[PDB]
Amino acid sequence: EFLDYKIIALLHDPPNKAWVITGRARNLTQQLSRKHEKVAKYIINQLFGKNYSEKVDNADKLASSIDRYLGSIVYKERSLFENRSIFLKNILLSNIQRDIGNLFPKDKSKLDNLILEYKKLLNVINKTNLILKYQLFYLIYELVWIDSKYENTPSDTRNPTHTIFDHLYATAAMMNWILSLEKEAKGYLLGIDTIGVADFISKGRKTRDLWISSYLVSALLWYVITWFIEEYGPDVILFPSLRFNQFYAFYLLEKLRKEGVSEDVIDEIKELITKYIFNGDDLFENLKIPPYPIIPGRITLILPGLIREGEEYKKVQDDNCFISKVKERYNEGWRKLIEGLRCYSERKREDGFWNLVCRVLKLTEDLLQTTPLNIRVKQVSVTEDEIFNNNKLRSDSWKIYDNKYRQLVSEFKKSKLVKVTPESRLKLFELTKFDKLPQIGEKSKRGYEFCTSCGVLPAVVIMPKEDELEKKLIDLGIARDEKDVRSIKNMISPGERLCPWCLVKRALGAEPRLMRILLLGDLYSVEKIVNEIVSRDVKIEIPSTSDIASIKTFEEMIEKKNEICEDLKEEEVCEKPSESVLSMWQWFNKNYYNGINLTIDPEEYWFSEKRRRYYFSVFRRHRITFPSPYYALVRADSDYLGDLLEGKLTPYLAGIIDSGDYANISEKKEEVNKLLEEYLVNAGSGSIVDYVKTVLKCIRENLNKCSCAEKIYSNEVAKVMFRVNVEKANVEEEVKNSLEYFETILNEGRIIVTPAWHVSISSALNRGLLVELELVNKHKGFVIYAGGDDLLAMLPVDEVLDFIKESRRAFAGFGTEKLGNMCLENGFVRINNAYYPSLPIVGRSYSVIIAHYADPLFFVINDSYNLLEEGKEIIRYRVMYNGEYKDAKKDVAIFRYQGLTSVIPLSLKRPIVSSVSDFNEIASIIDVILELKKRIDEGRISVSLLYDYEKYKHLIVASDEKYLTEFLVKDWIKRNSLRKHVEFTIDEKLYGVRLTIENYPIKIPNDLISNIVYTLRIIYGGEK
Amino acid sequence: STQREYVFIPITNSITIDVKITIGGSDHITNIDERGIHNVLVITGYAVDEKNGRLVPTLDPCDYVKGILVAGTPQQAQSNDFLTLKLPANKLYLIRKKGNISDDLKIYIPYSSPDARNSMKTKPVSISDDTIVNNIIKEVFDKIYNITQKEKVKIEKVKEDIKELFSYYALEQ
Amino acid sequence: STQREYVFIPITNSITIDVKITIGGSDHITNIDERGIHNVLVITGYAVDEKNGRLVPTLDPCDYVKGILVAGTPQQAQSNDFLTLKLPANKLYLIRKKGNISDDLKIYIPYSSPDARNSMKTKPVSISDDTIVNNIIKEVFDKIYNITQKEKVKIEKVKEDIKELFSYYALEQ
Amino acid sequence: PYYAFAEPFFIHAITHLHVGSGSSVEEEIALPFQRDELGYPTIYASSLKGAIKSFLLKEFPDKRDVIYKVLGEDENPEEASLGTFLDAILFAIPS
Amino acid sequence: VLEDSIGREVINRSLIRVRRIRIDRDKKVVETGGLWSEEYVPMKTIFFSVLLGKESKESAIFASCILRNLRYVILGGKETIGKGIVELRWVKD
Amino acid sequence: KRVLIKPLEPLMFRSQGEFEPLITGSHTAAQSLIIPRPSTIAGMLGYILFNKSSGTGDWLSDLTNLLATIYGTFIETNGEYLFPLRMGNHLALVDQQHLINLPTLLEKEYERREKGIYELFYDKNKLFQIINHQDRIGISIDKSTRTVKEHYLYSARYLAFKKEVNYVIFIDNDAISDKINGKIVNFGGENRIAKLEVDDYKVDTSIEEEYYLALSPILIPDEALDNFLDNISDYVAMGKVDKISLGFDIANTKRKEMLTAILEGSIVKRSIIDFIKNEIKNDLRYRFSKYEKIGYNTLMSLCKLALRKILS
């Protein structure tokens, strides 16, 4: 029968929840006449009536931690520990609050207005797709709340840690478990992590191969979870939270466009999507796909013990259902994609290139059966024996979701010890021995001619070398005339050998619209997607490394449009843009319709050999700086994000409680017991903070079980009797459970995780994603992939220090400008008065590679990934912890340039932020290096400054006097200045900073002040 | 804590009658749950005394004995030929674990002469002679866990996987 | 016709006397050619007490000890209590297997009771602070080795490869 | 067989020498020499072979056959070379 | 033959490490970012290596008349600065 | 019995495909393997002992007409046998004493196990004390302009040896102990040079245990894959499975075949030794016999230096 009434699980407690409690004027409490959910009941008008006996006695106590922080008697009675004000504390930082103010539904009329806005978007849907209205509501319930200006509320002013939405979505996520146990029995946790993504992304000549590799990584997982989001609704994914998800919103309004919905209500929500889920650009309507791959190849799911095909939900039949299901769904996604590729190819047997796609797909189907990228799926289960006592929840029924989650991840660790590359699933013995290998091109005089993109698989298509290609492609199976060469040579550089998987990549990159095949997912038939793709022909141009090395030159040529193309207009440069092309590269769209043909190939014009005499002379006469061949590959990631999601303290002190300090926490007892109490006391202003710190004074110094609570029960029993409507007396035990929970935390050494924790984290993660997206585009970068914590973008070597500074400060949630509609503010993200938290306590590392535009992207990507993953865990710098110099691990910026390395710390305080004074210390050295870079450009300081510091370090390190080191650096700068009197004044907190290493081939100066000059040498080598 | 006895599971039964308790305490060591035996204890450096079943401690860090940890009293005929140690449950080599530890478990251990009368050499051994399998199942494996062949209807996934999982080292002495 | 004694190296002066005879036997199964301390013995499942240095056997393979062989007798207030076993010179574990195979390996190891009155919370360590190296080079590594002071001219590298060739598991109780 | 004969030689610098490696070392130098694993200067066998090959191809601009046989071929049509160089290890620097 | 500890200081002291400059002709002043540093190995330095050769009837000619004539060759870059001349003495004395 | 392959200078063992100028607008590059695949050492020893009219199309039938059962390869610094140890993409040289307690270390629970593997691959690792990749960027110069060509630049990360190091392989035959001892081989790629040393060295082989160490890539019959990749966690404890190419043969000038293998340093459980025998036909046995002959399916006890083939 029909079940899964989580629509009220999303509404049981309204977003008007904190003002109706401790009201200022008390109007809605008298104009609606068991106290405050009256409002939500009134809000229940669009769908089924509210069930009150299924989501407050469970799945609300189990979703968030408030049930265990406050106590299950003060949690519900909601009146015995009060406060006037209304704050909101960052989940990771209970230190900084907010001033909520009052822009919320007060009148009995405006609430009707918001109901009407929900209705007009939810009244055009019928009831045959019962699940589709819940689907769209899951997304727009917050977008409408914040679109109309309304600041969002915490779960309770007694503990302002979770925003009202994360609590709601968390109750909904737990409802998957609670329905599945009020029914017969089950409860599930499904995790999926793609095997070796770093190796897969590092496989491609052109950037248009990295882009589609990452896009496939995101899209295959999107295809497998399409089944779940349509089956059990969207709120089945606990990572990544799809509340601010571009892929999800795209799929959602595309499915809404499907089946027929008036194209007048589709816009009312498309504007919501384009403004907030995106940042204010609807190019995904002009590209027909979400422009950025943003799905992390590692997802989680809360699965219920139910299944369909009884036309409704029946109990699952076995305990191997979802593993097999996701495996077959994944392989099915890949096979559907390649089938659509072959269909779209046959639809264009002309154009040469697609003809080759045809005549190689038909030859290698038996080799394309295996997906180029496999996954690794684990699951953990639970039964009502664990969260029930035949009448209610158990005590320790809260520590279940943790113990299961902590369970699941451990399994992954086990499977991780063995890595099996995808190329091993093939069967290449009879091919590579008995010459059965299909070979479009020259049969290699030496066996079988390995590929050039993946470099590991035998190549199928062997483009000849560039000696005389036109007479070399016709007499071979590649071409048929002189016309196809101008389109085959357009996407296969002469000389490239291509494997089946690498050629499939090249073909998908020829036009990135077949990806919809996977983005929609059993939604349209493959032929229906292809027939759209073959209907419109708009070109999607992905840059190259050369197009990004030549950014500043294109810029300088749009500021001299006519003058620099007077002598031109015979070279197809000032040629008028004749097509309707567009790119996911925002800087490209910003130009092109600025006078210069940005579709040219710098490899063909000035990065070429037969030419560039012409172009050098041109750039010379018109005061144009001839370009540099170097771009910069920036890669980022958060540190100890797994440890974070597991609730550890390592993200807080990254360098002290390292990873083996949880194999035995007793050796780090002092630091955990200081930090956890510092956080717990600091979360919840109210009237309970004193109560809580008295509970901790009890726990502190191992005061025995309730042999001490008599010190504290007073502080509750004196207060429980401030209210009379309290029905029964239950204060004899709740004060015991409270310190039992607090001792549980302080003795396990980590905050116990709950679904609220996870949604609150992995929503801020996508918000930071949306922020860094607009950050990269500001610095003329090109986002290959950027999902939450990670990032992989190609920028010019000129705006990489600026970008690192800005992106680091923004990841903490602290900036200066608005980034679209995400107006970030000192640890929060203000979307038009809605304060969502951020990740200020989390450390983020960076790995910049200044690479020649012609370096092989395979090795560049491998070295970037290796530098990050290795250096971030092997180098230690002097950090101050509670006024005491210790050693730290993470938050470094590792620059490399063909043999020059440098590391730049970004924390200098091991708890990176505990106040609001810290938000300027963030990456405060990168702006020092910036200041120094803007002195050498102005010619005030000489570049000898970088080749002179050594004869000053040998004296500056043996020194223990600050005011002497200051004179010494001033003299090192004085001796190398060119103008009257420069002023650099290094901040004197960098002196004595000691970087170290655990004996790796990375060479690094042991002082930050020398890493600064090495970073400058790297940057300037980038302009060579 | 409730004490436990590591009993190697050899082809002989000169250890079968040493530990008595059937119910036990607040836990169990193995768990017969349709996957096989669980929490098999492996002691390295300690070969087996085939006759007069005991743990002959060699200094080779390579010989491994396969047995099981049984619950409770050693029949009180010990404290001269056996020895007692209390481990945190983390100093043991348990194999394909299922159950849950109690973070503290009294362990008793046999011991034989270090055999200064014959060259301490060794050979391997495996679970063959399919009839002697059920003989040790019904001799001691039921004297500790009698619920075998009683509630479980399966005979292959728990009862006929020992054929290659139990392999110990006999002195030939 | 060759009996050796197994001696360990803690940071404690508790094996200050182990043997009644300054040399004991008549051959050396251990060599020092200034390049390394060859043929040093390690055993698994044996942690060590510091004061009255006694390898208390905890059967955790993650607890070992690196100790050298020397001939002699355990003060003859022992040898009825320490371990007395013979090995066929094919099972003994040896680092830097460059030395001699005597084909006759009797060995006496400090061996005590597990004494289940506490838990065996073990603790490893690596030696440093050459004063610690020296207060045992005095009492052991020159007491048995008249070879010392003969080639001891590069007297440091013979002592530097002492550091990364020895590590045990203490109980800190 | 297969290196039946060997000829060692000293490479005595007549002028200063620079054999670059890009910016290959963490040093105060922008164009360092070719370093060993021990940081001592060296001349890679590739540089030595290429330099002597290029020199001989112009100092005996008729033995192209012999030099191409021993020191290998340039164009794609090739065959096993039959004389190799070992990396030049620094012997003695002046002081 | 110095000890390895002081040898790698004396030697790193023998290596030439110059700073070079690129001058703006119209004002005879250094161009911004027109300064770098190099590293030559001193005159009279000695390197050692071996020519390993198989026997294929070209070696009998190569190693007999080509090699007998070689004394000076040019190694490495910057030969306009005159930084490549070197002399090959064969170990036959 | 034992053979020491002492490199005279840094060596290059490429592992991937093209290393030549093919795309006009990009440099090439390569990276060396720390331990040469046994195909390399087999081919070297074969090059030493060659007859010029045998095979011509087999490259290992006639090669196995020359070699004994080559046993796996590992490092030896100063009598300190270093052994490869591989995690997912992590490769470390660990001494012997850190492999004994290893099977128990991966069967420990979560934090203990991860701390152990971390200190092993990161702190008790000795790779970076003996070997560091030394990059060597080269160029091609066209005589017309005396300058680098159109991006004819290549970066080959060589293998620098920070100290006296050999490679240890054992070979059954003794008649060869004199015909390769003191030979200056052309070991490895890029025209590098090594020297051979031979001395009789008794090594114990016939030993069986529960956990083994892949001293050499364990080849898979290319049909048991679906029977193998499904239940991988039941055969290898830690390590790396991958698709490798057996190399490049000289007599035919062809890239050798491609086989899924279990790379060096991986830890295989005993349940695999029979499995392959259970999952191999009668003539693929005749082929993998030669494969094991040239040194591929080599194992080693984690307790003692006891080598063991698989199909033998």
Ligand SMILES: Nc1ncnc2c1ncn2[C@@H]1O[C@H](COP(=O)(O)OP(=O)(O)NP(=O)(O)O)[C@@H](O)[C@H]1O
């Ligand atoms: N959509 C994506 N596009 C590109 N890279 C991604 C994407 N999602 C995740 N990654 C990266 O892939 C890696 C995933 O973590 P991890 O799984 O440890 O790496 P892996 O390369 O997948 N290897 P493995 O750990 O064995 O699965 C990280 O480097 C991520 O930043």
Ligand SMILES: Nc1ncnc2c1ncn2[C@@H]1O[C@H](COP(=O)(O)OP(=O)(O)NP(=O)(O)O)[C@@H](O)[C@H]1O
């Ligand atoms: N529990 C988790 N859930 C989801 N993603 C995770 C989890 N743990 C790690 N990841 C992500 O998986 C990829 C690789 O994680 P990884 O970086 O290896 O873990 P980490 O905890 O971030 N430690 P670190 O190496 O310091 O970064 C990145 O996308 C991580 O953010």
Ligand SMILES: [Mn+2]
């Ligand atoms: Mn992964």
Ligand SMILES: [Mn+2]
């Ligand atoms: Mn991370």
Ligand SMILES: [Mn+2]
């Ligand atoms: Mn990692």
Ligand SMILES: [Zn+2]
């Ligand atoms: Zn390929």
